[PDB]
Amino acid sequence: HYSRKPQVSSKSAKAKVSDLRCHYKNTFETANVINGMPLRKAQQLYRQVLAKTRCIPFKRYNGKIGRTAQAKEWGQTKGRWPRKSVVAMMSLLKNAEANAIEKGLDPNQMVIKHVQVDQAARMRRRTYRAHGRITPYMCSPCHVQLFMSEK
Amino acid sequence: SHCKFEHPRHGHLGFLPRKRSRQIRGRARAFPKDDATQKPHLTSFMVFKAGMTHIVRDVDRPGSKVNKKEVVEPVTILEAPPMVIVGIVGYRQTPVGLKTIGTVWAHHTSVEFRRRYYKNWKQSAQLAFSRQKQFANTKEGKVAEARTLNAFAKKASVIRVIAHTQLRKLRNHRVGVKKAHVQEIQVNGGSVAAKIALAKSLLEKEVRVDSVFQQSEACDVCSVTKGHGTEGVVKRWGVACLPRKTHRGLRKVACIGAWHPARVMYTVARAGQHGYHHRTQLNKKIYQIGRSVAVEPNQATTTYDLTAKTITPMGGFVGYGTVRNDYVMLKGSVSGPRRRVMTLRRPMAPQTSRQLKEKIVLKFIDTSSKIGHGRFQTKKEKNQWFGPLKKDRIRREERLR
Amino acid sequence: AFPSRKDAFRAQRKGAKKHRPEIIVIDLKDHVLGRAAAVVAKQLLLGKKITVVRCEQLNIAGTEIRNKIKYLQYLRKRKLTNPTKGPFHHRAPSDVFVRTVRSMLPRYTKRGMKALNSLVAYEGIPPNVVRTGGRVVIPRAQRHVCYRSERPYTVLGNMCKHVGWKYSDVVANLEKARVEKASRHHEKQAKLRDAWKSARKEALAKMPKHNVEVLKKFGYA
RNA sequence: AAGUUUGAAAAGCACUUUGGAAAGAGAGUGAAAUAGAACCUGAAGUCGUGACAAAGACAAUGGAAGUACCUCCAUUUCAAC
RNA sequence: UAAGCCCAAUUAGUGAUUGCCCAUUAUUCCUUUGGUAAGGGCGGAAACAAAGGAGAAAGUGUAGCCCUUCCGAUGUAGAUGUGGCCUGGAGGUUAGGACGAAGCUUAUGGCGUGAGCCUAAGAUGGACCGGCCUCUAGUGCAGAUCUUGGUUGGCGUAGCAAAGAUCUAACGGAGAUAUACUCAACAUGCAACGUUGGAUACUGGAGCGGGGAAGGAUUUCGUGCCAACGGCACUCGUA
RNA sequence: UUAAUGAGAUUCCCUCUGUCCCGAGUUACUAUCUAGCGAAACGACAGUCAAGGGAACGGACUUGAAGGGCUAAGCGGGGA
RNA sequence: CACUGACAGGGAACGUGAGCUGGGUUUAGACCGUCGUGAGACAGGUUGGUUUUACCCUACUUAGCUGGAAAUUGCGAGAAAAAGAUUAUCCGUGCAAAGCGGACGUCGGGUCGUUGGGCCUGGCGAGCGGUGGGUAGUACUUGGUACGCUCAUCACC
Ligand SMILES: [K+]
Ligand SMILES: [K+]
Ligand SMILES: [K+]
Ligand SMILES: [K+]
Ligand SMILES: [K+]
Ligand SMILES: [K+]
Ligand SMILES: [Mg+2]
Ligand SMILES: [Mg+2]
Ligand SMILES: [Mg+2]
Ligand SMILES: [Mg+2]
Ligand SMILES: [Mg+2]
Ligand SMILES: [Mg+2]
Ligand SMILES: [Mg+2]
Ligand SMILES: [Mg+2]
Ligand SMILES: [Mg+2]
Ligand SMILES: [Mg+2]
Ligand SMILES: [Mg+2]
Ligand SMILES: [Mg+2]
Ligand SMILES: [Mg+2]
Ligand SMILES: [Mg+2]
Ligand SMILES: [Mg+2]
Ligand SMILES: [Mg+2]
Ligand SMILES: [Mg+2]
Ligand SMILES: [Mg+2]
Ligand SMILES: [Mg+2]
Ligand SMILES: [Mg+2]
Ligand SMILES: [Mg+2]
Ligand SMILES: [Mg+2]
Ligand SMILES: [Mg+2]
Ligand SMILES: [Mg+2]
Ligand SMILES: [Mg+2]
Ligand SMILES: [Mg+2]
Ligand SMILES: [Mg+2]
Ligand SMILES: [Mg+2]
Ligand SMILES: [Mg+2]
Ligand SMILES: [Mg+2]
Ligand SMILES: [Mg+2]
Ligand SMILES: [Mg+2]
Ligand SMILES: [Mg+2]
Ligand SMILES: [Mg+2]
Ligand SMILES: [Mg+2]
Ligand SMILES: [Mg+2]
Ligand SMILES: [Mg+2]
Ligand SMILES: [Mg+2]
Ligand SMILES: [Mg+2]
Ligand SMILES: [Mg+2]
Ligand SMILES: [Mg+2]
Ligand SMILES: [Mg+2]
Ligand SMILES: [Mg+2]
Ligand SMILES: [Mg+2]
Ligand code: NA
Ligand code: NA
Numbered sequence A: 001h002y003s004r005k006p007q008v009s010s011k012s013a014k015a016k017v018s019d020l021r022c023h024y025k026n027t028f029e030t031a032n033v034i035n036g037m038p039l040r041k042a043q044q045l046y047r048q049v050l051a052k053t054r055c056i057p058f059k060r061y062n063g064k065i066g067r068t069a070q071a072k073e074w075g076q077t078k079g080r081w082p083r084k085s086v087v088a089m090m091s092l093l094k095n096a097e098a099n100a101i102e103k104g105l106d107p108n109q110m111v112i113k114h115v116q117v118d119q120a121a122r123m124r125r126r127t128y129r130a131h132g133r134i135t136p137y138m139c140s141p142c143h144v145q146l147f148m149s150e151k
Numbered sequence B: 001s002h003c004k005f006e007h008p009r010h011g012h013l014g015f016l017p018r019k020r021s022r023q024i025r026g027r028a029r030a031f032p033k034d035d036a037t038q039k040p041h042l043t044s045f046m047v048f049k050a051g052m053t054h055i056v057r058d059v060d061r062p063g064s065k066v067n068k069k070e071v072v073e074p075v076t077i078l079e080a081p082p083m084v085i086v087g088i089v090g091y092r093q094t095p096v097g098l099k100t101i102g103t104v105w106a107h108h109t110s111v112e113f114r115r116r117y118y119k120n121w122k123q124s125a126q127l128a129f130s131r132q133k134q135f136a137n138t139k140e141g142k143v144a145e146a147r148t149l150n151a152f153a154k155k156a157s158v159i160r161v162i163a164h165t166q167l168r169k170l171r172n173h174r175v176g177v178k179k180a181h182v183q184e185i186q187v188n189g190g191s192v193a194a195k196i197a198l199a200k201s202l203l204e205k206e207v208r209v210d211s212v213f214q215q216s217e218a219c220d221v222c223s224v225t226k227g228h229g230t231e232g233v234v235k236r237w238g239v240a241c242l243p244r245k246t247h248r249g250l251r252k253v254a255c256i257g258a259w260h261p262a263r264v265m266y267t268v269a270r271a272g273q274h275g276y277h278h279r280t281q282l283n284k285k286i287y288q289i290g291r292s293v294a295v296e297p298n299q300a301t302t303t304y305d306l307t308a309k310t311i312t313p314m315g316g317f318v319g320y321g322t323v324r325n326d327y328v329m330l331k332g333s334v335s336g337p338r339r340r341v342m343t344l345r346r347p348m349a350p351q352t353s354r355q356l357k358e359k360i361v362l363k364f365i366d367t368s369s370k371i372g373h374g375r376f377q378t379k380k381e382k383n384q385w386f387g388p389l390k391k392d393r394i395r396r397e398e399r400l401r
Numbered sequence C: 001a002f003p004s005r006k007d008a009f010r011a012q013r014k015g016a017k018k019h020r021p022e023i024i025v026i027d028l029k030d031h032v033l034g035r036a037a038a039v040v041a042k043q044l045l046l047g048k049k050i051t052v053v054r055c056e057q058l059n060i061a062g063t064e065i066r067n068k069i070k071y072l073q074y075l076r077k078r079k080l081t082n083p084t085k086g087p088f089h090h091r092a093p094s095d096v097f098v099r100t101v102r103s104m105l106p107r108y109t110k111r112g113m114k115a116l117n118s119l120v121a122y123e124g125i126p127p128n129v130v131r132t133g134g135r136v137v138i139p140r141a142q143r144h145v146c147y148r149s150e151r152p153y154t155v156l157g158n159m160c161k162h163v164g165w166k167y168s169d170v171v172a173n174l175e176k177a178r179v180e181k182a183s184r185h186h187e188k189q190a191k192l193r194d195a196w197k198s199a200r201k202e203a204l205a206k207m208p209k210h211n212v213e214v215l216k217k218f219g220y221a
Numbered sequence D: 001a002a003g004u005u006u007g008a009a010a011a012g013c014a015c016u017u018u019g020g021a022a023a024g025a026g027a028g029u030g031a032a033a034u035a036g037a038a039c040c041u042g043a044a045g046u047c048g049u050g051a052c053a054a055a056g057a058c059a060a061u062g063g064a065a066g067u068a069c070c071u072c073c074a075u076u077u078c079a080a081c
Numbered sequence E: 001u002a003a004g005c006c007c008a009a010u011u012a013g014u015g016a017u018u019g020c021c022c023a024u025u026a027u028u029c030c031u032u033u034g035g036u037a038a039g040g041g042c043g044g045a046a047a048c049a050a051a052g053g054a055g056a057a058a059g060u061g062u063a064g065c066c067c068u069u070c071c072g073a074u075g076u077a078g079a080u081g082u083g084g085c086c087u088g089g090a091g092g093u094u095a096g097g098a099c100g101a102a103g104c105u106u107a108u109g110g111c112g113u114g115a116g117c118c119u120a121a122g123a124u125g126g127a128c129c130g131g132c133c134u135c136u137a138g139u140g141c142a143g144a145u146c147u148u149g150g151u152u153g154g155c156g157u158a159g160c161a162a163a164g165a166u167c168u169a170a171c172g173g174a175g176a177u178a179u180a181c182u183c184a185a186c187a188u189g190c191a192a193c194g195u196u197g198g199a200u201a202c203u204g205g206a207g208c209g210g211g212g213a214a215g216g217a218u219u220u221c222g223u224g225c226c227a228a229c230g231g232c233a234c235u236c237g238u239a
Numbered sequence F: 001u002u003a004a005u006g007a008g009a010u011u012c013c014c015u016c017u018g019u020c021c022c023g024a025g026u027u028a029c030u031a032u033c034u035a036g037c038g039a040a041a042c043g044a045c046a047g048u049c050a051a052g053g054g055a056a057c058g059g060a061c062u063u064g065a066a067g068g069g070c071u072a073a074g075c076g077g078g079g080a
Numbered sequence G: 001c002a003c004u005g006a007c008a009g010g011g012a013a014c015g016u017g018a019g020c021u022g023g024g025u026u027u028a029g030a031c032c033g034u035c036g037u038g039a040g041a042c043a044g045g046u047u048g049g050u051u052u053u054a055c056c057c058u059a060c061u062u063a064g065c066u067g068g069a070a071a072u073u074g075c076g077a078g079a080a081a082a083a084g085a086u087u088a089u090c091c092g093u094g095c096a097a098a099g100c101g102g103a104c105g106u107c108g109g110g111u112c113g114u115u116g117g118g119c120c121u122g123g124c125g126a127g128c129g130g131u132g133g134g135u136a137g138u139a140c141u142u143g144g145u146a147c148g149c150u151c152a153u154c155a156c157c
Helices: A024-032 A039-050 A069-074 A083-103 B111-115 B130-136 B139-155 B192-202 B233-237 B379-386 B390-400 C005-014 C033-045 C064-076 C093-103 C110-117 C156-163 C168-187 C190-206 C209-217
Strands: A012-017 A110-119 A123-129 A133-139 A142-150 B044-058 B070-079 B083-094 B097-105 B158-164 B182-188 B218-224 B227-231 B272-275 B278-290 B327-331 B341-345 B362-365 C023-027 C049-053 C059-061 C119-121 C153-155
Touching: A012 A083, A024 A083, A024 A110, A024 A142, A039 A083, A039 A110, A083 A110, A083 A142, B044 B182, B044 B327, B083 B139, B083 B192, B083 C168, B097 B139, B130 B139, B139 B192, B158 B192, B182 B192, B227 B233, B233 B272, B278 B362, C023 C033, C033 C049, C033 C093, C033 C110, C059 C156, C064 C153, C064 C156, C093 C110, C093 C119, C093 C156, C110 C119, C153 C156, C156 C168
Parallel strands: C023 C049, C049 C119
Antiparallel strands: A012 A142, A110 A142, A123 A133, B044 B070, B044 B341, B044 B362, B070 B327, B083 B097, B083 B158, B158 B182, B218 B278, B218 B341, B227 B272, B278 B327, C059 C153
16 A cells, blocks of 8 residues: 555565654655665664764755754755654664564665655644634644665 | 935945955965066065064154154064975966966975875875876976976966975964965066076975065065954944834844835945955064074064063963964054964055155063063063062972972 | 866767867958947857957947947946946957847847857957968958048057956067967968969969860969 | 444454554455445545656746657558558 | 938839838638628439449528528627527436446547537446436536635744753663674764652742632542643653 | 922933943843744735836836856845 | 034935834823814814834845756867877977987787888886885985985886
């Protein structure tokens, strides 16, 4: 039930999560950077982002965010270190690795071939403004799907 | 309608944009006009700002109220280690500007000069100028060098030498940089052949600051001013402060333009970068060209002050340290902080004024501490004042026992 | 301008000889600025590659002071709120000619800019154009056929050197050197030219006679 | 405000595996599981992704006429035609 | 030696009276449409199997009976006409559908000047429904600071800055000390929770101290628990 | 006309001062960067100018002059 | 009134309020004079009387990243270059001269083909050199480079 089909199904592993409760835009940035990576390189990247020695490049959702020197490796100038999205994607990568191992594949040979982050159904709260106004205070969850294929 | 009253505009529009300088070193945009009747000579030199002090001298300006009277002059001390000539460049006049004909490199280059070609020298392969050094002394390389020199002789109208600073000689702990600063120094005077001969003689050789400049001459200084980051209109441009009652802030320009033209003009003061701009300052008199402290100890001793002391004040120059090499004492101030490399250039303005031709003789140089209110010129005077202290007595007790 | 290593490698693989496009070199000396500009603009729009030299020797009708004042009036035009991005007043004579042609072109279309990039303008005759072939003139834009000789005229270089152009003396010295070199090379090769002329004269007798009569019929012998 | 309108029938996903769980990956029921539970169909708008077309700055859109490239489309021809 | 002004001309004292460019204009050709339209044909001439053809309706209006011939065609407000298009129902009449009905999708083609109609394909759907004549109406949307519902750039932006404040160890917790190879550890699992002990601070008796009224009504207590809620967090909680 | 009284209106004087000449330095909280969380207003379409005409003050039109693309912090000239 | 060389006149939506300020004009309170029967009026006087929003686009000020000459493509070839078996077949000097001065060689061999053919590669030596070692005496701002002889290799070969 994925938007894309793996080249060889028996050599691929799939992982999915729905209504993640992390920010959709931050997760969009965080998951997109590992598309095309080996699994191990992506996991190293997430650990180094947690350590704040490398950043997640922010594209398309970087409006008036700060500039950093760690974005230069991605050809960018704006990047951040969104830890909630990173840990959620680490859990998703662990699930994909578990699926690959149970299928009988080698987790050290997998290459992430598909990442897709979509906005989930939103959750509604309220904020209170001046002059007795009540205004939406919304949450934007996300769906994340991926599959990786052995090379 | 017209502005009610008149005052001059704030700031000089000829120093726009007020952006950060592309380089940190002072670079002479132009050189003094070339006079072919003069002997070939160098027109600039690179120095490092150590600090400031003041001197005493007797003025010889007839018609002034300070004629034959002593005045106190603040001065800037600039350390001037010898420079090394490593290259020759020639320029040809074309109707689109000067174009450099080619470069003649010295057979041997210093490690400091070759560090300038790397961002991380100590972890590099350090292969700079290696192929060039192998090729230069072969038959083909000698032929190529002769060909380039012949091209200089035939076509060049401007001859410049490539010189670099010696940071190992400048044994300074606060100057962190170890890669040499490289600049082109134009050779003025004589024919193109005479300039080529002088440049060839200077190749792979040191140049001392007293060869390029002499005492009581003036010079131009090219340097980058001290940086201050983002600043408001009050400090960046000198506009007036608004009344105390102003809503949303008073350190502003009240009107940044009329309704028409329907846009902000480039002549209106705005917030932005202040400082770290390249400036060329004119007519800095050279009050003293001192030798290295290792050669001549009594740097700051005059004829009128026999006290044996060096140009470094008590406690050293704040944030710089001691001056170990040759130095230049310029009258007044120069743009930039301490430790910044600066270019002394031979003057480009006429030097016929009574002030620019005055012969400077120093009678006193202040070497008191620049930390606090210094009141001793030397350590000897301080020890004379205090006599033996508790520490010295503890030391002598530890010695004799 | 400097070719890419890719382009040089491809040329080596193809092995083709040196290629020079068909380019017309116009000697703009003693030419009327506007008329030469109009002719050159039309020829550029027709797809021709044009290089113009000695643009410092173009002519404008009227005294030099009147044309200096016209240029200074042009220089008065600037965007007041930001002179950067305002009108750019080029002072070199070749740049002045390029601007005149550009004003006679549809400069705000791809076609007009294609025409404009096909024009190369120099002051004097630089070495890369000296030996590329015989230079042309524009008969309908030449000064001796366009101006009544009584009236004063301006040389473009003299006006430009007083409105801000810096390379008047450099161009003069380069032209002096070029003409000296070309005169030396033309005094030489005189033996070659005389040898070829005498060779044709002797061939007139060494060739079959009916061919000589045919040449006489068509005014060649 | 709100059709609990899944399916013929709960046959409402046993069991394995990763996960603290939510869930995922398999497996299974069913004719259908993008029919998996307030679940028939599932539009527009907006968004994600893969592939491709390119493209300065002429805001973009638009007309008219060509051309380059593509076309899971429509016709007509394939031989004394 | 105009590319200015005033006069003249059309390849020039050579031999006659049209230099050239551009219209939704003129002339002409083709096609459409409508006339205060103008005419012809319409009693099937005769003959003719497969292995020259087809049509020919006495007609306002249609895919117009058919053919020939002339003339006019823009247009706000406005009028009128249309075998003109479309929608939900009703009388009729013909069909279609589990070998897939309506709905929905389209670089999916065809037809029509158009409103639209029809076909194709769904790797869409799963049970109704099309054409024609007539009858009928709650019968056609781009905008009304239109109604309702949803979405949306702004935007990971403004901000979440009064009431001074937290630190440390241990325990608890999935919430860690979480790594493919090279490999001592830092440079690759961060940050965050509750309790207890220490430390530090604040409230400073007109108290973030004890009890009551009004109002509230189970918020009280213990155990479990973390989906949602306490605009950050929670393992804590008036959840 | 009036002692006393007045967050009442006015003038002058002493004192005093950053009200000013004429600004400078420093602090806390912001802004600024990050983690988590996360709106609104407004939104025809969009956004470089000069001059011309034009509903007589153009972002679109005419003729010229500019204009490589994307960004962070500010700013209040225009967006009548 | 006082300095000064002078204290010119004007425009920019009678420039400029999301720049300020709010003394005036011009709400609601109140007083006076005049007017009006009155409610009330007076460009008459008086006193008191909320100055909201930028985070969007441009402009401007600074501050970063980054492609691009067919201004992203074409392979679409233009040098402010040299001057030659058509730049190929050496290098200097000389005026695009007349001339002049210099070039490492030997003996094979492993391919493709006018001229002591082109390309590649082996064995010896010779040179101009680089990089290190040994050993002098100097120069230079004096810890670090160079220069003289002598080995070692390495590159042109
Ligand atoms: K004014
Ligand atoms: K949709
Ligand atoms: K097309
Ligand atoms: K106007
Ligand atoms: K106008
Ligand atoms: K005002
Ligand atoms: Mg901000
Ligand atoms: Mg930011
Ligand atoms: Mg609020
Ligand atoms: Mg309220
Ligand atoms: Mg004035
Ligand atoms: Mg002024
Ligand atoms: Mg500093
Ligand atoms: Mg205020
Ligand atoms: Mg001091
Ligand atoms: Mg309802
Ligand atoms: Mg089955
Ligand atoms: Mg389906
Ligand atoms: Mg459904
Ligand atoms: Mg109408
Ligand atoms: Mg109905
Ligand atoms: Mg489409
Ligand atoms: Mg209705
Ligand atoms: Mg509608
Ligand atoms: Mg949004
Ligand atoms: Mg913020
Ligand atoms: Mg905060
Ligand atoms: Mg706030
Ligand atoms: Mg607080
Ligand atoms: Mg930790
Ligand atoms: Mg206390
Ligand atoms: Mg307190
Ligand atoms: Mg206290
Ligand atoms: Mg209390
Ligand atoms: Mg919360
Ligand atoms: Mg009272
Ligand atoms: Mg009172
Ligand atoms: Mg801000
Ligand atoms: Mg942040
Ligand atoms: Mg305008
Ligand atoms: Mg507008
Ligand atoms: Mg504004
Ligand atoms: Mg006026
Ligand atoms: Mg005004
Ligand atoms: Mg304003
Ligand atoms: Mg205001
Ligand atoms: Mg007021
Ligand atoms: Mg009365
Ligand atoms: Mg008042
Ligand atoms: Mg009042
Ligand atoms: Na003439
Ligand atoms: Na898509």
